[PDB]
Amino acid sequence: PDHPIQLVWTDVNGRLSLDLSGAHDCFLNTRYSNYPVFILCIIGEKRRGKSFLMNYIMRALRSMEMDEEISLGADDEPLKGFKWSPGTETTTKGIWMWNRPFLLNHKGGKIAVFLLDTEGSLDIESDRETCIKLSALSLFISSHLIFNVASNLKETELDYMEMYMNMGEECGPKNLQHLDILVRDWYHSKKWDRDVARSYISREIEKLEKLNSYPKVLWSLKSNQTRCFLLPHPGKGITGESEGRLQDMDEDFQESLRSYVSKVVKGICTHIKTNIDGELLTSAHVFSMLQEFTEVLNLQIYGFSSPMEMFYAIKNQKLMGEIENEFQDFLKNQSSLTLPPTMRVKVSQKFSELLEKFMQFVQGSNTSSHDAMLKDLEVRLLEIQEKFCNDFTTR
Ligand SMILES: Nc1nc2c(ncn2[C@@H]2O[C@H](COP(=O)(O)OP(=O)(O)O)[C@@H](O)[C@H]2O)c(=O)[nH]1
């Protein structure tokens, strides 16, 4: 009985918890463990139709799995999410996924398509750091991210997008992070004009070019790497009480949804992701990356206010560890027969140089986190230095 499963939740203390058994049963089944995997994620504001679009994309994927044509019936009831929220039930917040993948055919192989809904993100101020960490975990394992927006792009959303752009830099050789900005309720009827979409795009690109911020999303927009899709209002047949049927939809919304679902489920085969090793990603790889990035986020104890800031904090904590190891190795190379005075001079100078190197290689502009990291690095290197010297006493 295929059902939705909650993969990652946020504990009361802010730690990110993972369903190890569920992720093992989903990503490591012997059937599709080595099939190339494709994770589709929907991030956006609540009550905007993310689960609805995911359910229709799911029906299209079922059609593709059984035969070869994308079809959706005119009177069929929904499945998963809210469009088919269980009679008298609703949903929780976190990362949710479809327990069973969808196997498609591409150039002699089977692609395992996983559907990931991020019910709960883009908060106003309700536990901001934890929401950032959850959405970052989602964006880390995603091969195609659909950002469900409701108007012009907001700073929060643009920062999330820049983070998604940056979180694929060491995930493959020439990895292109594919992003689909889905604007909801942008127009009513009016059929469609290819003018409204490129007008939205022109507005956004002007805003970003003046911002001198969010540069990589700006490049992706001006390079047609990230694509924007603007569908009309669903109509009162979907809003409120409804069984999410296409007979309950506006025909313009129906056709726009069909076009978008075609876009999304027909570009999977043409955009498989490669890892740094040069191989294609599989579901077991995704399980491993899930665990690894969950623990990486649970260990980011420094402060941040934006997604990009948490990205830079991850990187700078890694820099801290690298400098610690460099100092320890420098001390390991030092002889036990060196002149103690010149030895203390040398070690103090390595201390100073490593601190300056941290300062020159730090990333981001949050000088507060920079100072905190430098202070803690100073304390650790001081411990290392005094330890080496203390042992040098008895020698
Ligand atoms: N305004 C609007 N509502 C929609 C759209 N698609 C679905 N809805 C409705 O908005 C409600 C919330 O849907 P939901 O799937 O739960 O969105 P989600 O919470 O972000 O995942 C549902 O009852 C849908 O029927 C849309 O394109 N625009």
Residue numbers in the entry: 149 to 543
Which passages does the manuscript contain on this structure?
Recently, RNF112 has emerged as an intriguing addition to the dynamin-like large GTPase superfamily, which has been widely implicated in mediating biological membrane remodeling events, including membrane tubulation, fission, and fusion. To obtain an architectural overview of RNF112, we carried out structural studies on modified Xenopus laevis RNF112 constructs in different nucleotide-loading states.
In this structure, parts of G2/switch I and G3/switch II are disordered, whereas the G1/P-loop and G4 mediating the GDP molecule become discernable compared to the nucleotide-free structure.
